[PDB]
């Protein structure tokens, strides 16, 4: 904990559900943002940490709280971005084992988000700190001393602090996107590479230059796009549109009406036509004539 491992995470497609899954990973609570929202949000320069926690002291070092471990091993501001992920390293630390000495006796409190690489023996008394730990002066690191006995009390926890740099730079780490699969010759909404739209999609015979990925017409609408999944190229045509017209002989001269669908193919229109689908649109049995 005294020299905790600051890490940088970049160019990452990272799913955080797996971390939530493990029963030892009982703690993934985040001071920063909701874990469910986290799986969707994108961040950059993600900071991950490596440290050994007894769990008896984690409350003291928990963000928003300060303890002698927090005052010396790792100071952390009350607001904490990202999550504190703690899982039991009860066995690996038990047997015993005392290597991971962590700073508990240092002269002054350290600044938040700071790692103290060098060990500073506590300058407590006026008498000089010569001879490392001694009278009026105490060694900072305490042997973490995890045994089978210390497996139960002060339970060993393998804990990582995840504090994402909140996409100050372009976000380089986040989770899965773009799940839906494509269909052709159907009026469907599309979000191809995040480009929202609605239309009927068909394979585009027109070529694309290798750098060119999306096609714009004279109207600047989208007419072709290279598929994000495959190099196959899709023409996008807007879904069928038209205005309706009603022919009537007059209300007094019967109530039968004739509906004309202007500028649309007769095969294209079912009775489902969607916009204005309230009308039954009569039926195919009713005489349907395709006119200019």
């Amino acid at each position: 904990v005294y020299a905790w491992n600051r890490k940088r995470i970049s160019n990452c497609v990272a799913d955080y559900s797996v971390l939530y899954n493990l029963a030892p990973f009982f703690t993934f609570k985040c001071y920063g943002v909701s874990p469910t929202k986290l799986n969707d949000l994108c961040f950059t320069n993600v900071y991950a940490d490596s440290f050994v926690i007894r769990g008896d002291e984690v409350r003291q070092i928990a963000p928003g709280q300060t303890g002698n471990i927090a005052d010396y091993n790792y100071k952390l501001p009350d607001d904490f971005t990202g999550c504190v992920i703690a899982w039991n390293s009860n066995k690996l630390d038990s047997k015993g084992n005392y290597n991971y000495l962590y700073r508990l006796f240092r002269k002054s409190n350290l600044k938040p988000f700071e790692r103290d690489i060098s060990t500073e023996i506590y300058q407590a008394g006026n008498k000089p700190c010569n001879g490392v730990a001694g009278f009026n002066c105490y060694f900072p690191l305490r042997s973490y001393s995890f045994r089978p006995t210390y497996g139960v009390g002060h339970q060993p926890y393998r804990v990582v602090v995840l504090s994402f740099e909140l996409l100050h730079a372009p976000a380089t780490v986040c989770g899965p996107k773009k799940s839906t699969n494509l269909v052709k010759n159907k009026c469907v909404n599309f979000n191809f590479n995040g480009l929202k739209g609605t239309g009927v999609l068909t394979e585009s015979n027109k070529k694309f230059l290798p750098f060119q990925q999306f096609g714009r017409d004279i109207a600047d609408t989208t007419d072709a796009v290279r598929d994000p999944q495959t190099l196959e190229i899709l023409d996008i045509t807007p879904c069928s549109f038209g205005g309706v017209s009603v022919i009537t002989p007059g209300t007094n001269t019967s109530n039968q009406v004739a509906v004309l669908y202007q500028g649309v193919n007769c095969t294209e229109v079912p009775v489902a036509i969607q916009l204005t689908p309230t009308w039954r649109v009569y039926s195919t049995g009713s005489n349907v004539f395709q006119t200019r």
Partner: antibody, heavy 118, light 109 residues
């Protein structure tokens, strides 16, 4: 208390799968790491790997990974080491010495002087 | 992993004298803190000393951990009947621990 009694020395016809038994007692299997070690007759012991006994997860020795099949049950507190199939070359002294990556001695088994011969 | 052999195979000597067990490591491993094993004669071995130079838990003051790197030289100030038995230098930090050649103490055939 933490004492480990292994299987007794047994005359064994070469070519059958036998689960040697190492009793565990007075310890939490997750809290106390168990290892596995065997001594062939008359020279230093050989590592069989270390088991995570709370999960009964034995990572066998690279020399003996797949060579022998090691199993143990935390609830029954008694190992069942299939040893793949016991062969005439497998004749050796087997010691149920608890230990992890630190490879400490902890408590050994009483000793398994299995002579795999007809 | 690291080959461990403690010179000699048998240090034939009178009891009560100071002796050292020079374990030879093919690769120098001070990070191993190797777990010295003292094989009880015809019994389940007891870890001689763990930590290479650190002493074993509950080991007598005569048994002193010493040696590091490619050569671990475990110093025993006074030989006893327990000392008159096979030893082993076994890797502690290093995985696939390797047992030593062994050492023994004796005076007469």
């Amino acid at each position: 208390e933490v004492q480990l009694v292994q299987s007794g020395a047994e005359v064994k016809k070469p070519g059958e799968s036998l689960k040697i038994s190492c009793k565990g007692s007075g310890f939490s299997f997750t809290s106390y790491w168990i290892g596995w070690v065997r001594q062939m007759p008359g020279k230093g012991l050989e590592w069989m790997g270390i088991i995570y006994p709370g999960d009964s997860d034995t990572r066998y020795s690279p020399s003996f990974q797949g060579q022998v099949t090691i199993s143990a049950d935390k609830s029954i507190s008694t190992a069942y080491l299939q040893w793949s199939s016991l062969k005439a070359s497998d004749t050796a002294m087997y010691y149920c010495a608890r230990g992890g990556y630190e490879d400490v001695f902890d408590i050994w088994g009483q000793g398994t002087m299995v002579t795999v011969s007809s | 992993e690291i080959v461990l052999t403690q010179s000699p195979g048998t240090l034939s000597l009178s009891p009560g004298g100071r002796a050292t067990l020079s374990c030879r490591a093919s690769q120098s491993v001070s990070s191993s803190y190797l777990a010295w094993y003292q094989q009880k004669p015809g019994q389940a071995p007891r870890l001689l000393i763990y930590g290479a130079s650190s002493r074993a838990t509950g080991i007598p003051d005569r048994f002193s951990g010493s040696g590091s790197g490619t050569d671990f030289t475990l110093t025993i100030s006074r030989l006893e009947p327990e000392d008159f038995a096979v030893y082993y230098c076994q890797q502690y930090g290093s995985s696939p621990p390797t047992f030593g050649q062994g050492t023994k103490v004796e005076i007469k055939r």
